[PDB]
């Protein structure tokens, strides 16, 4: 009865304050009363991040997980990087941490998280491959694409690189790219070992590519 | 947007150059690229540009823009879209400057190009 009376009185005061104002005191009093939904509603209406963080740090560990996740999402959508980081740490959700790391465009924290989480390897590698493609380290992009498995656009851009190299009189790079192309096609020869004509044509084309690379080296 | 009747007609021009362009361009998965090439062959650049934009193809459009003459526009398109053939575009602009006898611009775009250790001495000895 006493708890019910006090809670009802504070809820009525908060309801009156919603129409009038004074959101800070009412919200912070409603944090310790009962429901957290109305408090987050008025916080979103007022955009009072520090009070929300006080709620997150003062909330219990095993009940308000979803509310802390929503607060972290609100922080991230408001570019509150440090508060998003602390909320994610309090959540111990590896998926959200990896998403934040890949969105923040850095690798060291992503690297240590990947070491701590052996179940998520390509989730960082593919954005890492994109970042490597953004820079001039094209060979690292090639090896990352080969490790991932997808190669069709990788093969097309490697052919473009070969054309660029042969045009720019850097015949050593052209020979290296031709050798890489021949190795990729021989990796395509990996499919089965039965006497299929695709195997013979791929083998002869690989021999031709190796000879072409040797000609590029000699001409260089 | 019909190809078979188009290539039959190109056969009926007795226009060997357009047929050679057809032969060298047919090795492309995208038919829109072939249509844009035929548009170039029949002299309307706007239609070819529209077709290239429709097919999300920029390297062929970058080559066409480099060829027609607006080098700076080609540089901008390459840097904002491809960024891979940017070195080739720089080298081609430097070669164009060398043709225009602008030695200073040629050497400048050489150092902005991938290689400048050997091109600059060669042009300097060619000029003397």
Q: What secondary structure does DSSP assign to B81-110, as a single string?
A: II-STHHHHHHHHHHHHHHTT-HHHHHHHH
Residues of chain A in contact with residue B88, where contact means CB-CB under 8 angstroms, are 164, 167-168
**Burial label, A88 (beta-carbon count in 10 A; 0-12, 13-18, 19+):** buried
| Long-range contacts from A138-147, C-beta under 8 angstroms, 24+ separation | A142/A180, A146/A184
Q: How many residues does chain B have?
A: 128
Measured distance CA(A72)–CA(A84) in Å, rounded: 5
> Cα angle at A5 between A3 and A9, to 5 degrees?
115
Quote the CA–CA distance of B121 and B128 in Å, as a whole number: 10
* A-proximal residues of B, 20-59, CB under 8 Å: 59
CB-CB neighbors (< 8 A) of B85 in chain A: 160, 164
Cβ neighbors of B91 (< 8 A, separation 6 or more) are A167, A168, B109, B113, B114, B115
Chain B residue with minimum CA distance to A136: B84
A158, A177 in Cβ contact below 8 A? Answer: yes
CB A212 within 8 A of CB A220: no
The tokens for B20 are 């050679």
Considering just the CA atoms, what is the radius of gyration of chain B in Å?
18
Q: State the smallest CA–CA distance between residue B105 and chain A in angstroms.
A: 19
Helices (H), chain B: 4-12, 16-25, 31-41, 45-54, 59-68, 71-77, 86-99, 103-111, 119-127
Q: Judge contact between A85 and A106, C-beta under 8 A.
A: no
Q: Does B121 touch chain A (CB under 8 A)?
A: no
Is A22 strand, coil or helix?
Answer: coil
A208 alpha-carbon distance from chain centroid:
41
Q: Which are the contacts of A179, defined by CB distance < 8 A and separation ≥ 6? A: A209, A210, A213
Q: How far is CA B81 from CA A30, A67, A115, B76, in A?
A: 53, 42, 35, 8
Which residue of A157, A164, A169 is in closest CB contact with B87?
A164
| Closest-CA residue of chain A to B89 | A164
Question: How many CB atoms sit inside 10 A of residue A195's CB?
Answer: 7
């Amino acid at each position: 009865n006493s708890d019910a009376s006090r809670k009802d009185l504070l809820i009525q005061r908060a309801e009156w304050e919603v129409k009038q104002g004074n959101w800070k005191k009412g919200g912070e009093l409603y944090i310790q009363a009962e429901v957290y939904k109305k408090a987050i509603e008025v916080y979103v209406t007022n955009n009072f991040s520090e009070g929300i963080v006080e709620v997150c740090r003062n909330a219990d560990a095993e009940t308000q997980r979803k509310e802390i996740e929503q607060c972290a999402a609100y922080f991230k959508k408001a570019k509150l990087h440090q508060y998003t980081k602390e909320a994610y740490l309090k959540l111990q959700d590896n998926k959200a941490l990896l998403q934040l790391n890949i969105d923040l465009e850095k690798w060291d924290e992503a690297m240590t998280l990947a070491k701590a989480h052996p179940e998520f390897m390509e989730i960082v590698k593919l954005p890492y491959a994109n970042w490597l493609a953004k820079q001039d380290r094209y060979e690292e992009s090639l090896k990352a694409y080969r490790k991932i498995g997808k190669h069709d656009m990788a093969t097309k851009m490697l052919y473009n690189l070969s054309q660029n190299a042969v045009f720019e009189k850097r015949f050593s790079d052209a020979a290296l790219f031709t050798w890489m192309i021949a190795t990729e096609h021989l990796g395509l020869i990996r499919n089965m070992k039965a006497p299929t004509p695709e195997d013979i044509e791929n083998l002869m084309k690989f021999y031709q590519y190796r000879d072409d690379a040797e000609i590029y080296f000699a001409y260089s | 947007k019909r190809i078979d009747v188009a290539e039959i007609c190109l056969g009926n021009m007795r226009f060997a150059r357009g047929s050679k362009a057809i032969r060298e361009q047919k090795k492309e998965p995208e038919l829109d690229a072939q249509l844009a090439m035929v548009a170039i062959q029949l002299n309307m650049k706007d239609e070819a540009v529209k077709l290239y934009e429709q097919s999300k193809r920029y390297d062929l459009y970058n080559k066409m823009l480099q060829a027609e003459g607006n080098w700076e526009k080609a540089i901008q398109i390459s840097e904002n879209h491809d960024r891979i053939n940017l070195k080739n575009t720089y080298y081609r602009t430097a070669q164009m400057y060398e043709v225009s006898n602008n030695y200073e611009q040629a050497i400048l775009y050489y150092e902005k190009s991938g290689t400048h250790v050997k091109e600059v001495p060669r042009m300097l000895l060619e000029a003397g």
